[PDB]
Amino acid sequence: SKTILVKMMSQAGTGFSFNTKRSRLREKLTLLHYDPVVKKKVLFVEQKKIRS
Amino acid sequence: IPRPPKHEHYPTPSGWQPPRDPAPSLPYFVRRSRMHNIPVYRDITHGNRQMTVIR
Amino acid sequence: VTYFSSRKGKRKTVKAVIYRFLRLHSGLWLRRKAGYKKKLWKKTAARKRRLREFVFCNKTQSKLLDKMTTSFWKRRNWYADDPYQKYQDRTNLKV
Amino acid sequence: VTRVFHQLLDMREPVFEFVRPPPYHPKQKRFPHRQPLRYLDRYRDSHEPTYGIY
Amino acid sequence: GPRALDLLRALPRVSLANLKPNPGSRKPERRPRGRRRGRKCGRGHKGERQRGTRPRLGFEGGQTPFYLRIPKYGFNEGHSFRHQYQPLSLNRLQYLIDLGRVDPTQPIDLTQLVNGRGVTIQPSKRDYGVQLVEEGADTFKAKVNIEVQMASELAIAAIEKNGGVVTTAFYDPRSLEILCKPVPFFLRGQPIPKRMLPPEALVPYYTDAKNRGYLADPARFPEARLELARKYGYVLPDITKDELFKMLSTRKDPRQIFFGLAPGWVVNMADKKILKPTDENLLKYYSS
Amino acid sequence: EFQSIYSLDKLYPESRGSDTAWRLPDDAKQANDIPVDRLTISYCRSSGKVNSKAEVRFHLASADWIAEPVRLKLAVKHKNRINRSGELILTSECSRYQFRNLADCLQKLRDMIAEASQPAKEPSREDAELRRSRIENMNRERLRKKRISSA
RNA sequence: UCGGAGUACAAAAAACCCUCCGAGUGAUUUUAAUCUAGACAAACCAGUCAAAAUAACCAUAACAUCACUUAUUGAUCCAAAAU
Ligand SMILES: [Mg+2]
Ligand SMILES: [Mg+2]
Ligand SMILES: [Mg+2]
Ligand SMILES: [Mg+2]
Ligand SMILES: [Mg+2]
Ligand SMILES: [Mg+2]
Ligand SMILES: [Mg+2]
Ligand SMILES: [Mg+2]
Ligand SMILES: [Mg+2]
C-alpha cells in the first residue's frame, strides 16, 4: 500500500489549505478543521491531490 | 559661524547658556567650542571602555 | 571576495550575502531560519513557528558577513515606513 | 467606607493596588545568538523612537 | 597664558634637527629578520597556509557554506528605490534657532537648514529630503515658517501651538540636489529646471490637508488645522493678525525650486544679473 | 510673482486669496467640548523609564459645560476617581511627550461624557471576573436571610 | 544517514572493518490554533521543551493516540504550483 498527500480546502469560502497524508485505496477525505481567517471549526473537503 | 543672538532670558529653550561677563578667578580656563558649547565629550574603546574627555 | 577590483581597484561586495541577510546599524545581522518553506505538512506547528522566526547571528558569523560586505551596506538608513527602524539602535547594554 | 474617611476621620481616602514583580530578563548580550528579533524589545526602555543628535 | 612658553626661553632653538613624533604615534613595524621573526616568519608550517593558498573568505572547507545554506529572503529587496527622509527633531531645530544658525524671521526650507549645517542631504543615497520628528515637542518655543518633505502629527501640533506654519512639499531627486547645494548649480550654467511632481504612490500624501500637503486644497487647511488643536488641547492662534504674517503665508509654486526665482531663468553670478527667456515656446514649457 | 499651470489657484479656482487657508471657522464648531481654560492641568515629569504623568482636574458640580443629567450620571460611574473636594481626576501616563498624555486625558473625558450623555448605555457586565461576586453575594444572602428585628 | 542496548558499572560526553537489535513507516480519529516569558541542546546549520495571554469549542473546554516510540529522514539554489 501507498499513502497520498492531498490538499484540503475550506468550505468557509476563505481560501485556506492544509495537506494531509491519506490512504490511497480509501474514499475522498472530509474533516472538521480550524480555519484561522474565520477563526472557526469548519468543514474541509479535499480539493486536490498533491503528492503520491 | 554666527555669534549667538542675545536673548532676554537665560537659559534658552534648548538650554544653552552663554559664558559670563567676567571670567572666574580659577587658575584654569575652559574655552568654549567653536559652536559655543562646553567641550565635554564621551568616548568608547574596545567597546567596553567608557571615558569622558574635557578639552 | 575580491579585495582589489580590476577596473576600480576598490573592494567588491559578495551579493550572495545581501540577498539573505540584513544588517542593523548596531552590527547585529538578521537572517531567516533554514528550511522554513520546506516540507511543511510533515512538521509540528511548534517547529513550524520556530522556523518562521527571524533570528540573530553569533559574533563569528557577523564578522564574516561584515568582511564579505562593503561599507555602503553599513550606512545609517532612514526609510519611510520601515519595519526595522525600531531595532537599529541598541539600548541598556552594559558591557 | 468612602464616607468614613472623609466624614469621620477627616482624612483623604487611601487606595491601594496589587503590584506584581517586574518579569525576569537575563543579562543582555552583545550578540544574542539564534534569538528571535523581538529579543531586542525585552530590554527596550520605553516604546518611542529617540533620535539622538538628529 | 601657556606657562610652557616660559620654559622655551631656557631651551635651545626648535629646529629641524630636534623633532620628536608624539610617543605612541608610530608603532614600529617588524620584519622577518633574525631569530624571533625569521624561520617560518609567522606563516606556520607546510599545509595550505604556509604557502599562502588558503581558500576564499566564505569557504568552510567544502561543507555547504553558512552564508549559502540560509535561504534568500527580501530584506534589502528593492532597497535602492526606497525613499529616505533625513530626520530633524524639533530639539535640533530649536537648538539651531537659539544659536542663530537658521533665523525664524524669514521662511525656513531645506536650503536654510543645509546652510546652517543643521542637516545634511545626499540625494545620491535617495534622500528625498528632511522629515520632521517630535523629539523636542514639549520644549519647543519657537515661531517658524517651515517647509519639510514629511512630518508627524505631533510635530505639526507642536509648531502650530507657537503660532507658526508647517507645510509638506515634494522635491524629485534632481530638484532636491539643486535645492540643497544651489551655488554649485548656479556655476553649472544651466537654466533653473521645473520641479517635477510626486509619483503616484506619494500623491495621497501631498493632497491631504492632514499632512498640510503643498498640493492640498487650502479650503480644508483651517478646518484640519483646528482639528489638531481639539486633540492636543491648546488655543489655536490667529495667524492673520500677526505682524510677520506676510512671511508666514509665503508658498512656492508646486513647479518652483526656490523662493522668488522661476523655472527657466539663469543666474549669472559674475555680473550679479538674472536672465529670463522672452521666447514664447520656452515660456510655455517652463511655466507649464 | 510666478504662476504655473499647476499652481494652487488654478488647481482649486474656488479658494484663492493667500489668507484663505488661515481663516478661523469658529462658527463651524460652536460645540467647544472641554473648554481647556476651565481645567487644572498638572504635569508630573518622571525621568529615569522616562514617562510624564499628566493630570486633568476639575470640579464636577461646578462644571456648567455639561448638562445636569450627565453631571449627575458621571458622579455615579466614576465616583471612584472623584476626590473629597468634589474634583474629578483623570490621569495619563504612556508617552514621554505630554502632548500625547494631555490628548489621552481629553479623549478619556470625551468618552466619559459620551457614554454618560447616551441614555442607551446598558452598562453590560461580564460574568468572567463577576462570577465570584454573584456567587459570594448569593451565598452571603443565604445567611443574611435570618429574620428577626433588632435594635 | 537515523534510533535502542553493551562497550561507557553512579552528572554529561566518549572510539573501533567492536558486540547485538532496529528505521527510510503503518494504523487510527481525539484533525491536533495564534502568540510569546524562560530554558535544554549545540562548532555552525539544524534540533528540543514551555508558563502567562489571545481565539476555538463543555459555554472559567489546547500534550493527537498505538506499534520497545526512540528512528520513520534531506540544506541552498532551481523548478513546477498561485495564496
Ligand atoms: Mg573615538
Ligand atoms: Mg611589512
Ligand atoms: Mg620564528
Ligand atoms: Mg637559520
Ligand atoms: Mg619547511
Ligand atoms: Mg600539515
Ligand atoms: Mg545622511
Ligand atoms: Mg548548556
Ligand atoms: Mg496557556
Side-chain angles (χ1 to χ4, degrees), chain E residues 34-42:
Chain E
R35 232 207 64 254
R36 226 243 62 174
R37 316 219 149 55
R39 180 211 153 118
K40 307 204 195 306
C41 324

Side-chain angles (χ1 to χ4, degrees), chain E residues 29-32:
Chain E
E29 95 291 354
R30 305 179 186 294
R31 300 168 69 242

Side-chain angles (χ1 to χ4, degrees), chain F residues 1-120 123 128 130-151:
Chain F
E1 297 286 356
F2 181 68
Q3 284 248 359
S4 77
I5 288 189
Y6 275 99
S7 165
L8 209 39
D9 303 311
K10 305 171 187 174
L11 278 187
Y12 304 101
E14 192 185 353
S15 69
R16 289 197 311 167
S18 59
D19 39 332
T20 293
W22 315 127
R23 284 310 173 200
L24 299 177
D26 296 328
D27 305 321
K29 334 171 193 175
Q30 202 174 348
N32 192 15
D33 53 323
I34 317 173
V36 195
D37 310 337
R38 270 187 180 175
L39 308 178
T40 287
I41 296 177
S42 320
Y43 297 118
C44 259
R45 181 189 176 187
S46 301
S47 292
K49 294 182 180 182
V50 207
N51 302 284
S52 182
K53 150 119 53 189
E55 176 142 324
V56 165
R57 276 168 136 265
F58 65 95
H59 195 104
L60 229 203
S62 172
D64 42 322
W65 67 78
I66 28 192
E68 268 302 330
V70 181
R71 191 183 325 180
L72 291 200
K73 274 192 176 183
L74 276 188
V76 177
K77 290 181 187 172
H78 307 339
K79 59 101 192 297
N80 297 93
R81 40 183 41 177
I82 315 186
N83 182 19
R84 84 159 162 180
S85 56
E87 311 280 317
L88 169 73
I89 293 183
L90 290 197
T91 269
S92 189
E93 203 61 20
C94 52
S95 175
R96 92 167 84 273
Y97 316 113
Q98 46 201 43
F99 279 59
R100 293 218 175 101
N101 300 323
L102 234 191
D104 253 350
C105 285
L106 297 184
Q107 193 51 43
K108 279 162 194 167
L109 193 62
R110 286 154 184 264
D111 281 322
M112 303 187 326
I113 300 175
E115 67 160 358
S117 189
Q118 291 152 0
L130 284 189
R131 245 164 241 176
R132 269 156 302 171
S133 213
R134 298 170 193 177
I135 297 179
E136 87 178 4
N137 216 31
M138 257 227 44
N139 285 350
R140 88 156 150 282
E141 280 182 9
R142 290 181 197 259
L143 310 162
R144 182 179 161 179
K145 224 165 296 174
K146 310 310 168 180
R147 281 167 224 164
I148 279 175
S149 52
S150 289

